[PDB]
Write a protein that binds this ligand. Sequence first.
Ligand SMILES: CC(C)C(=O)SCCNC(=O)CCNC(=O)[C@H](O)C(C)(C)COP(=O)(O)OP(=O)(O)OC[C@H]1O[C@@H](n2cnc3c(N)ncnc32)[C@H](O)[C@@H]1OP(=O)(O)O
Lengths: 15, 322
Amino acid sequence: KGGKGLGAGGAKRHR
Amino acid sequence: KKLAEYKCNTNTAIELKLVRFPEDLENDIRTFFPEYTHQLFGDDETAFGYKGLKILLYYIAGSLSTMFRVEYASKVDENFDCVEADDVEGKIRQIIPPGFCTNTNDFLSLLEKEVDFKPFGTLLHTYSVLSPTGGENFTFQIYKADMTCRGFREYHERLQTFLMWFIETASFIDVDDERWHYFLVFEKYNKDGATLFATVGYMTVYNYYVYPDKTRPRVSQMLILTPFQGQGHGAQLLETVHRYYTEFPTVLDITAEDPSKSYVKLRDFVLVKLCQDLPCFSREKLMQGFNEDMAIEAQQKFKINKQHARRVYEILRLLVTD
Ligand SMILES: CC(C)C(=O)SCCNC(=O)CCNC(=O)[C@H](O)C(C)(C)COP(=O)(O)OP(=O)(O)OC[C@H]1O[C@@H](n2cnc3c(N)ncnc32)[C@H](O)[C@@H]1OP(=O)(O)O
């Protein structure tokens, strides 16, 4: 989930 | 058993298809693959416990009615390998809605009635890619949709899964929030003497409140599905969204939530195209350096944000010189 109004609240990928 | 053969890269194990015709199920050209699986299968993007793992997520081209199957050649046995296989089925169930079919016969039965699928919302724009060579022409439409459109809420749940595969930090939006706006791209196609609609891509935009009486729409999520990428659709979509918001005096300008390098490149392309013929961006104006009136005209005419207007200036200045 993101906060109010957010659609990019996910984890970055770390290779 | 060679256990190394029971660890599988989920970026290649997950097979996506958009199906218009039954033959698409057997055509490997129609198969495309995630760029990201780290939000389900970790930074290593692996699933453990299966050899020849195939995670099939097949979608009817318009409605995105879904088939979900997990196939494998073999799996680990806890009695002899002393470990249990990853719950791949449960992980996928976390990000697709219930009610998917589980075999190609039931999937093909749904494809028979796909002609009933219609685009959601209000038509904003129609465009065609006409053959220069006497070949096939292709026709596309862009709609603005919302949760008052019959079937849209359920369709959006089927569609949003694709963001997890193609946007590094995708998260699912709160569709109860009335400030979300939705812009959809469809391709028209013919089948059995009828006209049908295929999902091409979409954008979500948050109508962010600016006190006391304005908004600053924020591009949140934007996806052109893999088979349609690099064909001008993203540029048509972002241009159509700017043109939509241009009709509202209460809109200041348009921003983006955490823009990607690919988005920045597309936005620069679109906003330069919109600004290039504006009087404030003439060669003689450009040669005198950046002037605020460029940002004012870009904001007034196309709801372009001041930061973005400065980039448009820099790119057009490079364009009028050697
Ligand atoms: C960043 C936040 C705000 C988001 O919105 S989510 C992040 C963006 N989305 C993703 O990365 C998901 C995966 N990628 C995609 O969905 C898409 O590839 C995309 C990034 C949306 C771009 O859409 P596409 O339809 O592939 O782009 P196109 O409209 O074909 O434009 C491609 C380029 O062709 C060129 N182009 C496009 N139309 C034309 C015309 N008419 N003439 C000449 N050249 C053109 C131009 O250089 C475009 O700029 P870039 O995209 O920056 O390279």
